[PDB]
Amino acid sequence: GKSTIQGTSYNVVKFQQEDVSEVVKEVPHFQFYYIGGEHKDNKYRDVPLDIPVLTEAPPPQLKKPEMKFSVLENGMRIVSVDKQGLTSNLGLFVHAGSRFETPAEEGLSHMVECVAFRSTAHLSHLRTIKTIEVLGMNGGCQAGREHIMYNLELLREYMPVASTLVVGNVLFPRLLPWEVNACHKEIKKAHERLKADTDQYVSELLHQTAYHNNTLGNALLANEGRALEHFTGDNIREFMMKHFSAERSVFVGINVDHDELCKWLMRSFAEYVAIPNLPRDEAKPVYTGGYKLEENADMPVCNIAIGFETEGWNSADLVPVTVLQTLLGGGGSFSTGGPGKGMHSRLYLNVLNQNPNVESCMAFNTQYSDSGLFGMYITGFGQEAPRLVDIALNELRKLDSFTPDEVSRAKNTLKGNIFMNAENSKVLMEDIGRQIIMSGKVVTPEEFAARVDAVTEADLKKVAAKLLRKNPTYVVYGDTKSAPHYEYVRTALASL
Amino acid sequence: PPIQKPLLPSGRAVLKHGRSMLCSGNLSYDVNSTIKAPECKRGMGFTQFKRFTPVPIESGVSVGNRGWFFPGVIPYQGH
Amino acid sequence: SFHRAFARVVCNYNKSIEGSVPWYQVKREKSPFQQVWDEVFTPIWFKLVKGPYERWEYNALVARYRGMGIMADDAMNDKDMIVERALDIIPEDIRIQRYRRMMRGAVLAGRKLHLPLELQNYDPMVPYMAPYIEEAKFQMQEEQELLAYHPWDRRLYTAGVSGFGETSMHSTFLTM
Amino acid sequence: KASTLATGKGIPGIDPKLPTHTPPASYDVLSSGKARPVQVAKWPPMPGGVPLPK
Amino acid sequence: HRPTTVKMIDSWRTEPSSEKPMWYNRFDQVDHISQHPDPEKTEKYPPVDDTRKLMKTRGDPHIMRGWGEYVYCHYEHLREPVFPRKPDVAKGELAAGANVTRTDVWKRE
Numbered sequence: 001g002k003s004t005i006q007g008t009s010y011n012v013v014k015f016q017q018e019d020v021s022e023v024v025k026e027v028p029h030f031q032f033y034y035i036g037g038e039h040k041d042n043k044y045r046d047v048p049l050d051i052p053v054l055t056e057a058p059p060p061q062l063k064k065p066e067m068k069f070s071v072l073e074n075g076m077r078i079v080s081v082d083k084q085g086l087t088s089n090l091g092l093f094v095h096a097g098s099r100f101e102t103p104a105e106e107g108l109s110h111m112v113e114c115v116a117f118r119s120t121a122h123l124s125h126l127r128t129i130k131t132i133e134v135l136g137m138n139g140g141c142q143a144g145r146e147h148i149m150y151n152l153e154l155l156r157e158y159m160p161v162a163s164t165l166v167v168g169n170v171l172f173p174r175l176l177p178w179e180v181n182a183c184h185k186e187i188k189k190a191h192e193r194l195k196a197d198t199d200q201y202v203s204e205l206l207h208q209t210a211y212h213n214n215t216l217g218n219a220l221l222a223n224e225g226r227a228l229e230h231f232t233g234d235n236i237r238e239f240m241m242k243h244f245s246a247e248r249s250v251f252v253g254i255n256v257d258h259d260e261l262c263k264w265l266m267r268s269f270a271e272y273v274a275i276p277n278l279p280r281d282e283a284k285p286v287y288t289g290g291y292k293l294e295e296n297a298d299m300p301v302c303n304i305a306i307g308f309e310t311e312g313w314n315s316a317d318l319v320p321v322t323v324l325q326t327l328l329g330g331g332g333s334f335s336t337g338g339p340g341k342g343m344h345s346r347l348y349l350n351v352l353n354q355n356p357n358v359e360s361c362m363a364f365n366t367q368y369s370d371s372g373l374f375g376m377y378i379t380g381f382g383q384e385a386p387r388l389v390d391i392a393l394n395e396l397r398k399l400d401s402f403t404p405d406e407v408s409r410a411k412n413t414l415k416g417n418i419f420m421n422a423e424n425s426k427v428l429m430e431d432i433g434r435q436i437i438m439s440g441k442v443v444t445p446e447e448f449a450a451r452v453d454a455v456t457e458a459d460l461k462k463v464a465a466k467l468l469r470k471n472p473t474y475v476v477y478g479d480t481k482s483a484p485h486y487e488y489v490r491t492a493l494a495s496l
Numbered sequence: 497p498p499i500q501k502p503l504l505p506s507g508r509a510v511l512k513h514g515r516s517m518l519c520s521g522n523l524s525y526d527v528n529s530t531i532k533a534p535e536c537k538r539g540m541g542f543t544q545f546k547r548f549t550p551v552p553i554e555s556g557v558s559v560g561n562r563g564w565f566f567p568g569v570i571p572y573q574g575h
Numbered sequence: 576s577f578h579r580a581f582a583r584v585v586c587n588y589n590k591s592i593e594g595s596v597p598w599y600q601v602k603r604e605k606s607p608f609q610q611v612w613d614e615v616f617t618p619i620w621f622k623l624v625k626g627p628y629e630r631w632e633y634n635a636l637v638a639r640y641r642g643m644g645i646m647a648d649d650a651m652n653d654k655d656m657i658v659e660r661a662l663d664i665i666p667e668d669i670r671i672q673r674y675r676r677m678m679r680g681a682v683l684a685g686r687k688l689h690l691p692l693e694l695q696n697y698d699p700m701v702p703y704m705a706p707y708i709e710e711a712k713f714q715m716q717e718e719q720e721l722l723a724y725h726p727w728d729r730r731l732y733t734a735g736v737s738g739f740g741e742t743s744m745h746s747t748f749l750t751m
Numbered sequence: 752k753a754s755t756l757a758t759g760k761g762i763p764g765i766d767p768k769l770p771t772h773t774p775p776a777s778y779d780v781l782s783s784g785k786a787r788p789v790q791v792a793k794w795p796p797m798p799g800g801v802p803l804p805k
Numbered sequence: 806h807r808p809t810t811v812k813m814i815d816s817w818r819t820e821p822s823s824e825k826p827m828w829y830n831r832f833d834q835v836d837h838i839s840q841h842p843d844p845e846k847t848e849k850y851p852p853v854d855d856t857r858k859l860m861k862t863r864g865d866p867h868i869m870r871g872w873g874e875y876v877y878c879h880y881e882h883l884r885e886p887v888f889p890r891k892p893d894v895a896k897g898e899l900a901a902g903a904n905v906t907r908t909d910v911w912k913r914e
């Protein structure tokens with residue numbers, strides 16, 4: 001380790017000047033045109049698949065995967081893990097989400113996502129996307145509340161090409177006026193995609209109500225009215241100069257050789273200057289609580305959510321609150337889970353099994369760098385809303401005590417979820433990138449398991465007590481014509 | 497060998513906004529998971545026909561517009 | 576099969592000229608014969624025929640543009656696809672004056688009148704469309720290469736289009 | 752001289768800063784970085800610019 | 806569009822525009838389009854009273870050569886090479902299209 005950045009040590013990669021002729025020899029070989037060819041009959045045309053045909057296979061070389069950390073001289077951090085899979089997952093994470101927008105800059109984070117993979121200094125829009133398509137790669141860009149991610153999924157032999165294309169989005173994009181204007185379409189599509197997912201749409205309503213008109217309450221998506229005034233290449237460039245910098249960016253690669261990944265990323269920034277790092281206003285979220293009743297004339301069901309503020313990812317309450325979510329668990333009538341699929345979580349036993357009118361009840365837990373939301377999400381028919389809220393409130397009043405059996409089951413299920421979620425490479429990539437952006441550090445799945453084992457009932461009681469002292473956030477979506485008023489919820493929770 | 501994924505790759509983030517690997521539940525069966533194994537109520541096999549895009553179909557939505565028309569304007573004989 | 580042999584010949588030849596420098600980018604010295612021809616024919620031909628004829632045509636063209644009050648780049652016809660693609664991206668201030676100049680020219684020409692001499696002292700050969708013509712050619716060359724490198728097969732005379740490539744409905748006689 | 756539009760400012764030829772013609776300048780290396788190839792002709796060019804096969 | 810064709814080819818006898826521009830290759834570059842002068846508010850050349858006093862033009866009457874009918878124009882349809890000649894923007898030459906994307910003229914220090 002040659003450099004310590006935000007609590008993690010990285011190996012410094014030096015820039016080197018390499019002639020373009022020499023590097024061209026190392027670029028992966030592929031063709032776009034096949035002008036003629038040498039005819040060759042399929043030699044296995046008469047061989048059934050049950051007969052092996054490959055002989056003299058070289059012996060395998062297996063190495064235990066390890067996460068390695070490196071950083072360029074411009075300050076871009078590189079973290080990769082090689083699981084020896086045949087498909088890579090490259091990810092570029094930039095610490096510029098919707099939370100850093102000013103009210104006059106509403107929606108600019110989403111606008112950056114919309115213009116992703118458009119023309120750059122050394123490539124056109126068409127050539128970038130046709131290269132991604134011809135090489136069989138998939139991916140895109142997603143702008144969140146705290147970060148924006150560029151990701152590509154590809155065969156690992158084409159990593160040199162993929163890394164170059166991703167980096168070009170933040171190194172030297174040409175935000176040409178006519179290309180940007182063609183991206184105004186994506187705003188309407190983004191709204192439709194969000195509203196289709198009822199669970200996510202309710203989550204956005206929670207955050208807007210929980211954090212009134214401040215960092216984590218800023219709308220994720222740009223509106224299609226007055227926001228289009230500053231949906232311009234010039235405005236986007238000014239936003240990127242404020243926030244996009246090599247010091248706020250992290251490149252994550254799964255199933256890629258670290259040295260090769262570092263080498264090719266180094267060659268991309270060798271002869272160019274990245275956006276310089278400048279100070280920015282970083283204000284802590286202000287939690288206000290509140291309520292919002294959003295009618296959806298088409299939906300006959302009522303989706304209710306009651307949330308409370310959590311300190312966030314960097315707190316010591318991260319694991320105990322996560323254990324609390326698994327203990328309460330939840331579920332829904334839609335699915336019929338078999339053994340080990342939450343059939344014995346507290347919400348499933350106390351709500352779903354005893355209230356046939358409840359369509360679904362779950363506990364949600366969103367975590368960000370310095371804040372989060374915890375609460376219950378319950379759904380049912382519109383006329384049932386007064387009873388649905390009472391059920392939710394009753395469960396919130398039972399968080400005062402927990403049985404030893406429930407704690408152990410919750411701890412074991414959480415550990416299983418951690419390990420089973422980790423084996424997915426796209427999940428591992430997104431987990432690593434978000435952790436470094438949020439904390440500057442990566443906690444491995446095994447280390448999280450050790451923390452989970454140390455959670456006691458006292459910790460659960462303490463964390464639950466803190467959550468219940470916050471002003472509740474109360475969201476009703478769908479058929480809201482029978483839901484109770486906000487003051488009813490607050491008086492019910494005022495006792496705690 | 498069998499193909500276990502749809503011919504159209506999602507290209508989206510697996511994790512939902514604000515939810516991490518730790519607090520997302522079990523992605524194998526959780527309702528909100530984007531990679532949950534579908535339930536075989538009628539048996540295994542239909543996932544080869546299945547449309548995995550969560551957005552509902554909007555019949556007749558235009559994707560063949562090259563910039564020749566504004567939204568809401570009806571082309572007449574292609575012009 | 577002779578087609579297979581022909582396909583291999585084409586593949587080998589093209590593989591042997593990849594990365595070749597185009598003829599115009601080679602530093603070429605004229606032969607001892609073309610130099611003599613340039614020494615004798617070209618100077619006399621310019622003095623007596625080419626020079627005077629082309630000056631006569633050029634000066635007439637400048638006068639015609641000045642009489643209409645238009646620029647040379649205004650005279651381009653948008654039936655040419657490069658011109659149409661370039662005109663899509665020109666900025667509004669350039670567009671406004673281009674339209675006004677072209678409208679005045681057609682009124683003058685139609686009414687058999689000429690611009691007052693007070694307004695004729697300008698250089699009509701300023702190349703204001705050049706940045707956009709070059710961008711349009713780049714966009715079109717990318718599309719040609721990455722999307723139109725083969726004669727594609729499509730279902731014929733369906734959806735108002737012949738299926739032979741054109742993209743507008745009812746744009747041929749056989750698609751009425 | 753060429754100080755004002757009346758004196759000839761901005762008129763190629765009359766204005767010192769603007770040349771009468773703008774021919775491209777010669778280069779010794781291609782934009783790729785390869786050395787520019789050199790071909791010294793000894794016979795007149797082909798009638799139609801037809802290139803010969805390799 | 807209706808059935809249509811452009812002569813976007815690699816000629817055997819005529820160079821591409823990147824190699825030999827046919828227009829007067831002196832342009833002024835700004836940082837933002839708003840920095841350009843406004844023609845409506847910009848004084849034009851002093852009006853003349855005689856057609857013989859009108860100013861000179863920048864066009865070259867003999868820009869094109871060879872057999873064929875005379876023509877003066879600034880543009881052609883020919884294709885460019887993947888490695889186009891690097892434009893001399895320092896002197897005022899125009900940089901647009903391939904000479905920007907497939908070159909390093911845009912790079913400052």
Ligand SMILES: CCCCCCCCCCCCCCCCCC(=O)OC[C@H](COP(=O)([O-])OCC(O)COP(=O)([O-])OC[C@@H](COC(=O)CCCCCCCCCCCCCCCCC)OC(=O)CCCCCCCCCCCCCCCCC)OC(=O)CCCCCCCCCCCCCCCCC
Pocket residue numbers: 576577578579
């Ligand atoms: C300068 C440098 C040096 C130059 C060197 C030049 C080198 C070339 C010259 C040497 C060529 C050698 C050729 C060797 C041939 C090998 C033969 C062999 O072993 O067979 C394997 C060979 C290939 O087998 P394969 O591997 O399975 O591949 C199948 C493909 O055919 C494989 O083909 P493909 O897939 O590649 O497709 C191309 C295909 C097809 O290619 C073409 O057909 C080209 C079409 C292009 C368009 C042409 C438009 C028309 C132009 C007309 C111009 C006229 C100008 C006139 C000018 C006049 C004034 C000057 O080509 C062939 O079939 C190969 C032809 C082989 C030679 C035999 C036919 C030649 C033409 C004879 C015409 C005679 C006309 C007489 C007129 C009399 C008038 C009174 O067998 C054949 O297929 C060959 C035969 C093809 C059909 C020919 C006609 C047969 C007629 C039979 C009549 C039966 C009558 C029965 C009557 C019964 C009554 C009861």
Ligand SMILES: CCCCCCCCCCCCCCCCCC(=O)OC[C@H](COP(=O)([O-])OCC(O)COP(=O)([O-])OC[C@@H](COC(=O)CCCCCCCCCCCCCCCCC)OC(=O)CCCCCCCCCCCCCCCCC)OC(=O)CCCCCCCCCCCCCCCCC
Pocket residue numbers: 723725726727728729738739740809810
């Ligand atoms: C001494 C004895 C000597 C004997 C000598 C014997 C010699 C025998 C000679 C036999 C004939 C040889 C002819 C060779 C011509 C070569 C021309 C050439 O270089 O073409 C390249 C050229 C490619 O040009 P390009 O600039 O690279 O790209 C074209 C596009 O801009 C952009 O291209 P793209 O690829 O991007 O666009 C996609 C699209 C592009 O598609 C096209 O380019 C199609 C263009 C429109 C075709 C339809 C025109 C409308 C109908 C006209 C006829 C009206 C009346 C008919 C009925 C009358 C009844 C009373 O491509 C495709 O769709 C690919 C598949 C095409 C085949 C589809 C098959 C189904 C449809 C059937 C019709 C087409 C058959 C193939 C062409 C046959 C040529 C003869 O392709 C064509 O020329 C296309 C065919 C158009 C002509 C069709 C003519 C049909 C026959 C009419 C009667 C003629 C009588 C006069 C005398 C005939 C004898 C000479």
Ligand SMILES: CCCCCCCCCCCCCCCCCC(=O)OC[C@H](COP(=O)([O-])OCC(O)COP(=O)([O-])OC[C@@H](COC(=O)CCCCCCCCCCCCCCCCC)OC(=O)CCCCCCCCCCCCCCCCC)OC(=O)CCCCCCCCCCCCCCCCC
Pocket residue numbers: 737739746747748749750808
């Ligand atoms: C040294 C010797 C030299 C000898 C010289 C002679 C050489 C021999 C060959 C000469 C002929 C060449 C033929 C070229 C065929 C070209 C095919 C083609 O590409 O067409 C599409 C093409 C359009 O190109 P495109 O837009 O790229 O195609 C894309 C679209 O998909 C295209 O689609 P599109 O829709 O945009 O365009 C299609 C276009 C295509 O059509 C044309 O443009 C005309 C093509 C055919 C030309 C006429 C051929 C005539 C010759 C045959 C007849 C000979 C009879 C002899 C008898 C002798 C008896 C003693 O229009 C039509 O299809 C119109 C069809 C109208 C049919 C109406 C029929 C009546 C209504 C229906 C039936 C009746 C009602 C029902 C009644 C029921 C009763 C109960 O056509 C043209 O652009 C060319 C048109 C022809 C121009 C002139 C050609 C000159 C040829 C050079 C040699 C000339 C030498 C001097 C001759 C002097 C004569 C006095």
Ligand SMILES: CCCCCCCCCCCCCCCCCC(=O)OC[C@H](COP(=O)([O-])OCC(O)COP(=O)([O-])OC[C@@H](COC(=O)CCCCCCCCCCCCCCCCC)OC(=O)CCCCCCCCCCCCCCCCC)OC(=O)CCCCCCCCCCCCCCCCC
Pocket residue numbers: 608609611612615616795796797798799800801818871872
């Ligand atoms: C007494 C005082 C006399 C004073 C004499 C003064 C002499 C001055 C110096 C002369 C030096 C000449 C050689 C210098 C090199 C050539 C020039 C050059 O390269 O310039 C650059 C010029 C262009 O350079 P570039 O632009 O860099 O090249 C780009 C392209 O690749 C190429 O450019 P491109 O793509 O533009 O094409 C080049 C050119 C292609 O080049 C040519 O065309 C060259 C033509 C040369 C003709 C010479 C032979 C004919 C005259 C015979 C006279 C006989 C007199 C008998 C006297 C008897 C006394 C008892 O094509 C064109 O320009 C297109 C022409 C289109 C119009 C055609 C009109 C034809 C109408 C015919 C109608 C007929 C109807 C009735 C049927 C008749 C049937 C018979 O290069 C060329 O033109 C390339 C071809 C050069 C061929 C030279 C051939 C020389 C032949 C000498 C024969 C000597 C025989 C001696 C016999 C024994 C003696 C005892």
Ligand SMILES: CCCCCCCCCCCCCCCCCC(=O)OC[C@H](COP(=O)([O-])OCC(O)COP(=O)([O-])OC[C@@H](COC(=O)CCCCCCCCCCCCCCCCC)OC(=O)CCCCCCCCCCCCCCCCC)OC(=O)CCCCCCCCCCCCCCCCC
Pocket residue numbers: 798799800801814815816817818819
């Ligand atoms: C015993 C006798 C036996 C006789 C046997 C004869 C057998 C002959 C078999 C012929 C087979 C058919 C060939 C047809 C080819 C079709 C090709 C085609 O359509 O291509 C389109 C294709 C389309 O390309 P694109 O990419 O769409 O467009 C290209 C761009 O435009 C721009 O492309 P780029 O910038 O890359 O430029 C490429 C360059 C490439 O250019 C070349 O390489 C062509 C050079 C041709 C030179 C011909 C000079 C002939 C001079 C004769 C001198 C005789 C001297 C006698 C001395 C006597 C001393 C005692 O082209 C040009 O610079 C412009 C080409 C303009 C072509 C104009 C076509 C007119 C045809 C009709 C002319 C005649 C009709 C009027 C007169 C009739 C009555 C007399 O064009 C080309 O690629 C260029 C090809 C041009 C070929 C022209 C060939 C003309 C040949 C004339 C022969 C005259 C013979 C006289 C004999 C006299 C003896 C005394």
Ligand SMILES: CCCCCCCCCCCCCCCCCC(=O)OC[C@H](COP(=O)([O-])OCC(O)COP(=O)([O-])OC[C@@H](COC(=O)CCCCCCCCCCCCCCCCC)OC(=O)CCCCCCCCCCCCCCCCC)OC(=O)CCCCCCCCCCCCCCCCC
Pocket residue numbers: 620624625626628629869870871872873874875
């Ligand atoms: C016994 C012992 C005996 C021993 C003897 C031994 C003999 C040995 C002999 C050996 C001979 C070897 C000679 C080798 C020569 C090599 C030449 C060469 O390489 O040239 C390359 C050269 C290509 O190189 P390049 O660099 O492109 O050359 C420049 C171009 O020429 C053009 O490019 P540029 O940039 O220089 O041109 C600019 C452009 C622009 O050109 C112009 O500006 C020309 C004007 C354009 C006018 C357009 C309208 C046309 C109508 C004109 C009239 C109307 C009025 C016009 C004026 C306006 C009035 C208001 O020029 C053109 O477009 C040229 C078009 C020319 C026709 C237009 C009309 C010109 C005359 C106008 C007169 C007007 C007079 C008005 C007076 C009023 C006074 C008040 O190619 C040719 O020139 C070839 C031409 C074709 C030749 C074919 C020959 C075939 C012969 C076959 C039969 C032979 C039989 C022999 C039998 C013998 C038996 C014994």
